[PDB]
Design a protein around this ligand. Structure first.
Ligand SMILES: O=c1ccn([C@@H]2O[C@H](COP(=O)(O)OP(=O)(O)O[C@H]3O[C@H](CO)[C@H](O)[C@H](O)[C@H]3F)[C@@H](O)[C@H]2O)c(=O)[nH]1
Ligand SMILES: *[C@@H]1O[C@H](CO)[C@@H](O[C@@H]2O[C@H](CO)[C@@H](O)[C@H](O)[C@H]2NC(C)=O)[C@H](O)[C@H]1NC(C)=O
Ligand SMILES: *[C@@H]1O[C@H](CO[C@@H]2O[C@@H](C)[C@@H](O)[C@@H](O)[C@@H]2O)[C@@H](O)[C@H](O)[C@H]1NC(C)=O
Ligand SMILES: [Mn+2]
Length: 267
């Protein structure tokens, strides 16, 4: 597949239950370390294997290139291909992750694509997945069902009419954190080259899923994915899956809060 880096893992031997694919740019080492030390730490979650990998492209900076080469040697959890790692190449990054699942870990029961500014509660996500009885053609997150493309030309999410020419986006889930049954990876990889390209990765996956006739589903009767962010509380964060707008220092503090309060009761 032309990968420059591949994690030292053998999903055929020990099929993981949940694989996290985490986006971050080259310079965001602090984010990756905070995640490695918090919700990204590999472990058994109620007897289910969690695995964690970081998606990276390449950069012009020789310094950053060397940093990441050393980081990969030290941690062995980086998936990398040769594409310029910039915001408007996130679609390639996401497709890299999906291609990796397809080529090297099709045995994963579930895959979560997520970002580096996030708190993820893997314990509660795993509980909710074990309760869904949905093991195939499954895709969930924060559902965005009738979104309109942003035409304000200086907006971070602006797309011109030539980039995306229609009035509404397909159904899709926030790229902040979405989850799917491992089989979906192969399906999306397969239809990817046939679907109109768009620089917003979450919209692009939405296009792929629509072509595949895979409908988006809510994970639970209550909201569990929060792209808008949330006021922090131990009891609230025990019963959510994903929360956005979390910088590394904050992530470490929240993780410590949950450890300090382990084994209290919540209403
Ligand atoms: O060059 C980069 C720049 C950013 N990122 C990572 O991409 C994610 C999203 O970047 P931002 O948090 O700066 O912006 P935003 O929250 O608006 O991104 C949103 O819009 C994007 C459209 O591609 C994605 O869908 C994304 O998941 C979704 F959250 C982050 O994890 C960031 O670390 C990279 O990997 N490489
Ligand atoms: C997305 O990454 C691709 C691949 O690195 C970029 O395309 C290359 O652009 C460089 C200059 O940045 C050229 O030297 C190469 O010839 C291009 N090759 C390919 C594969 O097209 C592309 O510019 C990046 N996208 C953005 C928006 O920066
Ligand atoms: C999933 O199923 C749970 C118990 O499942 C048993 O086997 C499944 C496959 C069904 O046939 C079910 O009728 C059986 O009792 C349920 O307790 C649980 O609520 C289900 N999850 C859902 C629907 O959210
Ligand atoms: Mn973000």
């Amino acid at each position: 597949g032309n990968f420059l880096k591949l994690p030292d893992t053998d999903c055929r031997q020990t099929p993981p239950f949940l694989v996290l694919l985490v986006t971050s740019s080259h310079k965001q080492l602090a984010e990756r370390m905070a995640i490695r030390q918090t919700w990204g730490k590999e472990r058994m979650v109620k007897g289910k294997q969690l695995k964690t990998f970081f998606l990276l492209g390449t950069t012009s900076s020789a310094a950053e290139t060397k940093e990441v080469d050393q980081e990969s040697q030290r941690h062995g959890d980086i998936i990398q291909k040769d594409f310029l790692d910039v915001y408007y190449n996130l679609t390639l990054k996401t497709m890299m992750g999906i291609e990796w699942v397809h080529r090297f870990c099709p045995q994963a029961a579930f895959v979560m694509k997520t970002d580096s500014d996030m708190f993820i509660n893997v314990d509660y996500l795993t509980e909710l997945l074990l309760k869904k009885n949905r093991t195939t053609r499954f895709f969930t997150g924060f559902l965005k069902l009738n979104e309109f493309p942003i035409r304000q030309p200086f907006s971070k999410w602006f797309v011109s009419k030539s980039e995306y020419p229609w009035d509404r986006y397909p159904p899709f889930c926030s790229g902040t954190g979405y989850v799917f049954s491992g089989d979906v990876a192969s399906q999306v990889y397969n239809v990817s080259k046939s679907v109109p390209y768009i620089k917003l990765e979450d919209v692009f996956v939405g296009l792929c899923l629509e072509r595949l006739n895979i409908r988006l589903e809510e994970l639970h009767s209550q909201p569990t994915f929060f792209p808008g962010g949330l006021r922090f509380s131990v009891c609230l964060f025990r019963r959510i899956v994903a929360c956005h707008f979390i910088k590394p220092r904050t992530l470490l503090d929240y993780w410590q809060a949950l450890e300090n309060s382990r084994g209290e009761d919540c209403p």
